[PDB]
Amino acid sequence: TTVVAAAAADPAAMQYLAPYSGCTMGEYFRDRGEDALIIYDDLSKQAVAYRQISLLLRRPPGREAYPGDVFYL
Amino acid sequence: MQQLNPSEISALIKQRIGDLDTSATAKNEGTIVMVSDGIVRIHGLADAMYGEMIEFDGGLFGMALNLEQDSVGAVVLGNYLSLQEGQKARCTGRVLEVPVGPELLGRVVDALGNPIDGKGPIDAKLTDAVEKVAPGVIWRQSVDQPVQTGYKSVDTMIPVGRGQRELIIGDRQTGKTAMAIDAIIAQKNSGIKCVYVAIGQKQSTIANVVRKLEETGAMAYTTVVAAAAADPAAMQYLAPYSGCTMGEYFRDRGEDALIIYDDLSKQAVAYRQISLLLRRPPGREAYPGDVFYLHSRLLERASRVSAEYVEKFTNGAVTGKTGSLTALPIIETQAGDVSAFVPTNVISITDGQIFLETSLFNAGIRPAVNAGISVSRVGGSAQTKIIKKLSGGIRTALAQYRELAAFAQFASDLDEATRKQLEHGQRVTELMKQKQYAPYSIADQAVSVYASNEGYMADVEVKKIVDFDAALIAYFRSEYAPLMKQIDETGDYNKDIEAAIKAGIESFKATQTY
Amino acid sequence: QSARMVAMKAATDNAGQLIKDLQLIYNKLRQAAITQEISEIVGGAAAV
Amino acid sequence: SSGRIIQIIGAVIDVEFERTSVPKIYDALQVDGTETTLEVQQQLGDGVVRTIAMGSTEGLKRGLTVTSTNAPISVPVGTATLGRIMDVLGRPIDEAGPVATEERLPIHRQAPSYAEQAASTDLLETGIKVIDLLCPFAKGGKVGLFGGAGVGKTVNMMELINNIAKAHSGLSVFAGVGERTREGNDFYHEMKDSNVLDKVAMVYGQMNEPPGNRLRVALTGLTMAEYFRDEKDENGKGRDVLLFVDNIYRYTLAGTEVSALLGRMPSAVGYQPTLAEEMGVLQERITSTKSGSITSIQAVYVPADDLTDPSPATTFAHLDATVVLSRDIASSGIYPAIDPLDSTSRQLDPLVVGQEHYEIARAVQNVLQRYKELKDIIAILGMDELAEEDKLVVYRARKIQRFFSQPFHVAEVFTGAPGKLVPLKETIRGFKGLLAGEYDHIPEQAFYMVGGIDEVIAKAEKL
Amino acid sequence: MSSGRIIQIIGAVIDVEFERTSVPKIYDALQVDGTETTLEVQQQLGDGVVRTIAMGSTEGLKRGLTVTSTNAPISVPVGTATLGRIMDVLGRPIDEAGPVATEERLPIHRQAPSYAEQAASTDLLETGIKVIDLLCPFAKGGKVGLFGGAGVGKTVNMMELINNIAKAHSGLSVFAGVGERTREGNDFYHEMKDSNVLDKVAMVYGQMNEPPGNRLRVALTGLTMAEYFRDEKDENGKGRDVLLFVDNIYRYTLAGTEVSALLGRMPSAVGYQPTLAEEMGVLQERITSTKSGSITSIQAVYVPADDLTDPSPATTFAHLDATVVLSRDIASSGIYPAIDPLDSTSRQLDPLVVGQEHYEIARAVQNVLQRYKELKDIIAILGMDELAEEDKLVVYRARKIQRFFSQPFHVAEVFTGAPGKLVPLKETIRGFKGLLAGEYDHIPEQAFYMVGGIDEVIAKAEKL
Ligand SMILES: Nc1ncnc2c1ncn2[C@@H]1O[C@H](COP(=O)(O)OP(=O)(O)OP(=O)(O)O)[C@@H](O)[C@H]1O
Ligand SMILES: [Mg+2]
């Protein structure tokens, strides 16, 4: 097992990027014919961190103040 | 690429091309550049102080709020429509001040301490800053002295002590102003100076209030600060602070005072307008960031100070005593929505609140005090001994009546126990009704509450309780005047006074009847 | 009489459940209204 | 000494003047080519002023010469403005010819000071049984006519004017602030038919004009009423004027539309920051002074039947009475259709109206609001199973509801020109008797569509 | 040079211009020359301009005024000299008792402890309230919300908790008032001085008449003092265990919203600042148990509009471990402490953490209380005699249980002559295991009232 940690005191950028780093770490086995399993924990908090990042950039929000591309995230 | 600054003007740029000396023309003179909606932007004024008092050419007065990089925003205390760009503005090197002292009693003044009742000038020997800081936490002292309002429900179930901050909250036309004025009137013999501050009201209603105050002799110790609905937003924003300074004058010198802010909601509205016209970022309901800091720093000045503070402030002149200042703000809510922004902020600051219900007001219950949710955190320590002893029966009777009020409609298969509770609860509820401008001294409340507690009202019909109470109080006022004087002077509650009261009550029923 | 007692108790319980559902709906609507108001205010302020 | 238009966006014009000559706030500018008239709102520096247009903003170029007048908008006043119809600027629009007077006043003035407020609060009596009993007016007060579906609220207004005129020779002013032209024309024709046009002056912003009109028609009408009041005749005493504003809700939205373009951030529900300021400035000139008085009647529109939003909430602080019309009460055959339980007033006070008046009103309200509660029980069980008490309440409440009916004099059709104008004492006597029970034996159909108790007695005896 | 000048004042937001080489770091503290006023740096706008929040009133400040820098965040005094004093956000005495006698300072902005520094276990924090221990146990390094308003004895609970932690574990305490009403702050100070608790507490008061800057940083100041208490070690290492009281964290959240609104940042969902979660995490994550010691926090919580799904309590609830809810009716019936034994929850109440027996005893107690609540309405409506005998036993033992959750406090010893009792674990469990098995069915109810362990219950029954 591999654990990628982005705690509650970490900068919002680290929380935004942690699942992508985990997915890249997990895709090493997939490309080489070996099965793997990844567990994202509280993607809602990733969405909150990305909302914080976008609002500080003065981007207009949508429903519940989430940014326009929270789906594409 | 940003918009043009107020300092970017063809004439000003030409002057700047000319020469850069004189340090922006002596640093204490300005030049108006913009005029709109009661806001004036000035160019220059290097030595402007945040909150300084600026004087224009016409004879008006402003107050610099925004000290920006190249301009100086400033609200206008008088009326604009006389200020035109190109005029000159000057800074007085001073912060806003109002006159204080025992010469403003009986007068009606502006937010700046200017008489408007046409009785001549105000000969005041002192001035004080409008914006101050509340005394430190170490200088305070606990609240243990009572303030009477004259209402049988309020003085028994939601007591108010000297130094407390009690809120009056309710919908429109529910009797807030009348309760505040009755509280002011009931101070005939307490010897505490009152201050009534009116914000954003019709001058007709202000004149009616002033006339009614002068009729009852309550103007010998009252000062009225009136910022009407047609007055500029700056005056309505500054009225509470100028009233609070006038009130604090007495607190710092060992005497007691009481101040009533009317419609703090309208001060919030005026401050929101002023902030929005000055381009400040809004929050919920378009309020600026610091509405809470606008209200709290005003309400925290109502306090009670220890004898050491007053002895130090007066340099040993008034050693013995301890001062105080009581506040009674008023908030109006839309359809009983106490979850809005300003009422939520004001509730969190005060030491209690007196809810007035529209439904109780329409049903004929006047005053409409909602005893279920009203609360006073000071509690028992703000009551005289007799009323503190006697209030328990009233409180438990209201509780029991409110618990099982649903049964009042059936009234058919009610068992013996609950029917007695209903009979007592309805009678106590009928007891609490009261008229206007007729306050009850502590002795009247004591007599009424004792008569209700001991079942002496258990045999009188519900519809005629008010007449019974009025007749009993009149009979006691007529015959047993020395006992009433004793109770009013002291407030003691012994077995002797209790026996005398019981004897009087028993004599009343045997003799002439309501 | 016994049946009426039982029916009234059941009706009281059902009303108590209705309250707990309507409270959640009301809270959701309150938060949505506050969000809409703030969004409109910020947009109107930024457009000026 | 004259400037050029440099920017046109919607109805917000900009003019650039020489820096030495810049007009004050609320000055009146007259574009040279056309008949459009501007008024200044702000000063933006560099001799630039931002204005709004009182009329057609279409066909205006940039760089079009503009001259100033150095004074606010002045409207004609006097006795020569009685019976005419005028727009904002005071130009006649009834095609009857130019207004033959020379007295003019600016429409923007300061509110009366605190010193000159009326020393007392007189009681104004009309003659309508519902209003004079449950919702008494005040001399120089402010009255709102809330709610009401398509019903004779206009009928109520002309009844009120006829009653005030035939009782008192005082004048009147009607200022339709954003009114439907159909209703305005109907009102004008009715005034012309009843020979009351000799005592009314009119101002019209007709809901399809630029917001400057719908914003300043009220101020024009108020200036005319002020001049009528301040005229002191033959003794040294002013008159008592009556002023109508047919829709006060339009006045707020008229400023709301221009607020955003003028460069102001929004507010709670999108209103202007200065909503309370504008309402106070308008509503603080309608007061009774030491010399004369202005009393007003203002129909108020509640958007979406929700009176917690700022538009009527800020009006409620100024009203002395609220007469609430209702659909159902008019449906049941009660013509005046004032809601007895909801319509209230600040003037119902034993100090001002005496003790018997207040007690009678309270008793009537209690009876009505208990009968309204008995409705579901009456519908389910019927009238037989009620107690012996609460049957008298039903009968007396039905009688009271019938007795609020009133024949309207101005109708003259289907009624019989029945001007009643009952004195207040008659109504007090009648309702005291009815509550006491001296008339409990009379059929309820007798109390319908009559005036005093003498008439109901005569009708009952005839049948 | 470090010195710069003010170029803009808007309410409480002051801009300062330094020369382009000497722009100070973020969160640096600036001192205004000639006055007493501390500015905290919030963001760097470039070209030497810095936007700051003022800690105090700004009236009387004018542009072009020289400002000097400190090249460090706000520093507060720490040590044993802070015990028994009242301090503002900047670490200055407001109790009028002279200057603080210590010399050690620390910055209030520092990184939370890393992953490698976390403790090797999360066991418990024993404290003999006899209700907290059984139903809603605490945990070292935990965070305990405290629901309920004034009038039920919040302050008395804080008194008793401070006394107990100082007595048993030799630990100190810190009180951090975020938005403290001056009247109630003075009352609390005198109440904690007349009882001798105050020699153990270091108080920090940010009153609610101060700018929103102070009310946001008083919690960090109190946290810094608590951290210094934890970190220092006697011989054999093993730094102490500390409590940190933060009253009405909702006021901390609101102070976070206000300073964000002042700085002009676009609001989030329900008006809260976009950095709400990060602002809560920065505080709540420095409260934890490390190798040396631990910090436990008792935090009052206010639920706005009674809606516990809006961002403030929905964010606070993520960090809390246990919730102690006080009830009005429990206090009405003369039961102290008025802790609701049925609605107070704890994440530590698991068989894996507190063992096996304790979990089952607590669950059985809760089951009996629930059944009794279900039986009281039947008693009210249908007469006592309608119930079966099992329900008779349930009612009797539930009344005994409700009595047994009462005990006297050491702070009440001054008011009432009865000394306070600190009953540990392995003694409450015995009593409740015996009571649930019918072993004490012959004792009257009154013997289970205001008393410690089961032995004194037996004695008092003997004296009845
Ligand atoms: N306790 C009372 N007993 C009898 N009449 C009362 C009482 N209180 C108020 N009233 C009457 O009913 C009305 C309510 O009084 P009040 O002026 O205090 O209302 P309000 O809530 O302050 O209104 P608003 O906030 O809109 O100005 C007044 O007309 C007053 O005469
Ligand atoms: Mg009022």
Side-chain angles (χ1 to χ4, degrees), chain B residues 173-178 196 201 262-263 266 330 332, chain D residues 346:
Chain B
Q173 283 191 339
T174 54
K176 302 180 294 294
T177 307
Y196 174 77
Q201 303 172 217
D262 203 86
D263 291 331
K266 297 186 175 74
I330 292 171
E332 65 183 1
Chain D
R346 192 182 295 274

Side-chain angles (χ1 to χ4, degrees), chain D residues 170-455:
Chain D
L171 309 181
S172 303
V173 178
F174 177 92
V177 180
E179 187 201 10
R180 305 164 177 79
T181 52
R182 178 186 67 82
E183 302 181 355
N185 192 10
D186 294 353
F187 182 85
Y188 168 64
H189 281 307
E190 292 296 320
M191 294 298 102
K192 184 178 179 180
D193 283 349
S194 300
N195 292 284
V196 190
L197 191 68
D198 279 345
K199 284 135 50 153
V200 183
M202 287 194 225
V203 176
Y204 271 83
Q206 58 172 24
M207 175 169 300
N208 61 4
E209 294 176 349
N213 288 348
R214 295 168 303 184
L215 188 62
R216 309 298 189 189
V217 298
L219 293 180
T220 295
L222 186 51
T223 293
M224 285 171 176
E226 286 178 345
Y227 179 85
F228 280 152
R229 175 198 71 195
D230 289 345
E231 188 182 8
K232 284 175 291 298
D233 58 356
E234 89 198 345
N235 262 27
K237 173 177 293 300
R239 279 183 291 273
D240 291 337
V241 189
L242 180 57
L243 160 68
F244 290 2
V245 177
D246 189 359
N247 192 0
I248 207 67
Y249 171 79
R250 281 269 88 74
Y251 178 65
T252 57
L253 260 66
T256 292
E257 305 188 351
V258 288
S259 171
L261 290 167
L262 289 172
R264 303 170 185 166
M265 304 205 206
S267 298
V269 177
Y271 295 94
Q272 64 266 40
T274 67
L275 173 65
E277 273 296 318
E278 291 178 349
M279 185 63 72
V281 166
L282 168 66
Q283 294 264 11
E284 267 297 357
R285 305 162 70 175
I286 302 173
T287 43
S288 62
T289 71
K290 294 293 180 63
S291 61
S293 171
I294 287 180
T295 182
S296 166
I297 293 171
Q298 310 171 340
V300 182
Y301 179 78
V302 182
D305 295 346
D306 186 356
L307 55 85
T308 63
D309 61 333
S311 177
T314 58
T315 65
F316 271 112
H318 293 285
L319 299 186
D320 296 349
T322 73
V323 172
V324 170
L325 299 170
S326 176
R327 194 151 150 71
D328 307 344
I329 303 166
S331 71
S332 176
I334 306 302
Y335 293 98
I338 294 92
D339 192 357
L341 291 175
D342 182 310
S343 60
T344 186
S345 84
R346 192 182 295 274
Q347 292 299 326
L348 192 64
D349 188 5
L351 263 65
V352 296
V353 305
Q355 197 90 341
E356 56 175 343
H357 193 86
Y358 181 78
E359 189 264 336
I360 292 295
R362 279 279 97 80
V364 174
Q365 284 185 334
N366 284 343
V367 165
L368 282 172
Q369 75 181 24
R370 179 50 198 210
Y371 168 61
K372 184 181 65 60
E373 181 173 357
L374 289 176
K375 198 70 56 169
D376 291 331
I377 315 167
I378 285 176
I380 296 177
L381 297 183
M383 271 275 308
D384 290 341
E385 293 180 354
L386 292 172
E388 191 66 24
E389 185 69 14
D390 307 350
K391 283 173 183 172
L392 302 172
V393 175
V394 171
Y395 298 141
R396 302 179 198 284
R398 294 178 65 88
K399 286 178 170 68
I400 285 168
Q401 294 180 342
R402 303 290 193 278
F403 189 62
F404 285 164
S405 178
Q406 183 82 64
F408 276 138
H409 192 27
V410 189
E412 287 176 350
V413 292
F414 183 69
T415 56
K420 313 309 284 185
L421 309 171
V422 295
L424 186 68
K425 301 300 291 184
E426 183 72 21
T427 61
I428 303 307
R429 169 189 295 172
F431 270 118
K432 192 161 53 46
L434 175 53
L435 287 172
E438 285 90 3
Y439 312 103
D440 202 11
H441 62 80
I442 294 171
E444 63 192 344
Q445 276 300 323
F447 293 102
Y448 186 73
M449 282 283 326
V450 291
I453 297 292
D454 295 349
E455 300 178 355

Side-chain angles (χ1 to χ4, degrees), chain B residues 35 37 85 202-203 211 231, chain D residues 43 112 118 264 277 318 320:
Chain B
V35 169
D37 296 339
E85 70 163 340
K202 296 191 289 182
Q203 280 187 354
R211 281 197 293 267
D231 291 339
Chain D
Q43 299 187 342
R264 303 170 185 166
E277 273 296 318
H318 293 285
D320 296 349

Side-chain angles (χ1 to χ4, degrees), chain E residues 238-252:
Chain E
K238 191 66 183 298
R240 288 181 295 277
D241 295 349
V242 183
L243 274 72
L244 174 71
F245 300 95
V246 175
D247 66 339
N248 194 359
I249 195 72
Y250 175 68
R251 297 207 256 271
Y252 174 81

Side-chain angles (χ1 to χ4, degrees), chain B residues 151 171-179 263 332 361 366-367 434-436, chain D residues 346 349:
Chain B
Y151 280 77
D171 295 349
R172 61 176 177 83
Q173 283 191 339
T174 54
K176 302 180 294 294
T177 307
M179 191 175 258
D263 291 331
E332 65 183 1
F361 190 88
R366 293 182 183 174
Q434 192 167 353
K435 289 180 180 299
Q436 194 171 358
Chain D
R346 192 182 295 274
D349 188 5

Side-chain angles (χ1 to χ4, degrees), chain E residues 170-225:
Chain E
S170 73
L172 305 172
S173 304
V174 171
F175 184 94
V178 173
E180 179 71 5
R181 314 179 187 180
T182 66
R183 183 183 66 84
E184 295 182 348
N186 181 28
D187 288 348
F188 187 82
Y189 169 71
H190 281 298
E191 177 179 359
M192 211 165 48
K193 186 176 79 177
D194 65 19
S195 171
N196 284 319
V197 173
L198 189 147
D199 287 349
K200 308 160 174 76
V201 184
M203 291 185 258
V204 169
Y205 279 157
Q207 294 98 348
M208 41 165 48
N209 60 38
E210 311 254 86
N214 300 17
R215 301 198 302 279
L216 188 65
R217 302 277 186 255
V218 287
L220 292 175
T221 295
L223 189 64
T224 286
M225 311 197 185

